[PDB]
């Protein structure tokens, strides 16, 4: 724990920005139909992007980075960060996530079976890791600060590696019996990358069937 203080304000940041209960109540409260399911998912996503931006801002030395690479990182990690947060809802059964009803809506929102299947297979796998909130938080931070996104890569690594080290330590400090556990997590990140292509195809399908998104989502996903 040489300087685990950075973990302090990361969890502070991770708990800081939150989805309003009035908005997440719609997952439970509203009609269940293909159209309403899609609209609720779109509202959740566009709200979560704003939560994401506020989390990213608070990250160590994010604001000191190059301005246009900051956009490149936000755009590159958006889908992956939403998959991770949604995974956390399903895995921990976050009350305000209403996971069983969230699942009903995802399974009837115009998404192909081809994408539903690996989506929920991913959710189950990540759940079986039995991760803590600090793991979810650090993985999210690591995912956001990826040096290999399209469009200097070096200064991103300076911000990311410290977080990878803290995650590396917490595995050896909270799972001593499995020293393949850190590797396990990193493997699931590669599985997470798989959903970038899936999501681009999902957007195409939705668009040709006359679905529109929000200005914010349209910007961050290049719609």
């Amino acid at each position: 724990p040489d300087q685990q203080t950075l973990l302090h304000f990361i969890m502070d940041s991770y708990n800081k920005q939150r989805m309003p209960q009035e908005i997440t109540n719609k997952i439970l409260k509203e009609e269940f139909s293909a159209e309403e399911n899609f609209l609720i998912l779109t509202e959740m996503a566009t709200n979560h992007v704003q939560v994401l931006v506020e989390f990213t801002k608070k990250l160590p030395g994010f604001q000191t980075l190059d301005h246009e690479d900051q956009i490149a990182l936000l755009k590159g990690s958006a889908v992956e960060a939403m998959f991770l947060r949604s995974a956390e809802i399903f895995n921990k059964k976050l009350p305000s996530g209403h996971s069983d009803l969230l699942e009903e809506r995802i399974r009837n929102s115009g998404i192909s079976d081809e994408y539903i299947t690996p989506m929920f297979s991913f959710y189950k796998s990540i759940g079986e890791l039995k991760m803590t909130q600090e793991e979810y938080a650090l993985l999210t931070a690591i995912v956001i600060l990826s040096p290999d996104r399209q469009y200097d890569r070096e200064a991103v690594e300076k911000l990311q590696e410290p977080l990878l080290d803290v995650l590396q330590k917490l595995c050896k400090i909270h799972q001593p019996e499995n020293p393949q556990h850190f590797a396990e997590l990193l493997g699931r990140l590669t599985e997470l990358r798989t959903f970038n292509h899936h999501h681009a195809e999902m957007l195409m399908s939705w668009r040709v069937n006359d679905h529109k998104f929000t200005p914010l989502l349209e910007e961050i996903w290049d719609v």
Binding site: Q50, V53, E54, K57, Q63, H67, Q70, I71, L74, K75, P215, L216, E219, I220
Partner: peptide
């Protein structure tokens, strides 16, 4: 080019 993201970052 990415006005809304800039706006959220600067707010």
């Amino acid at each position: 080019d990415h006005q809304l993201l800039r706006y959220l970052l600067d707010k």
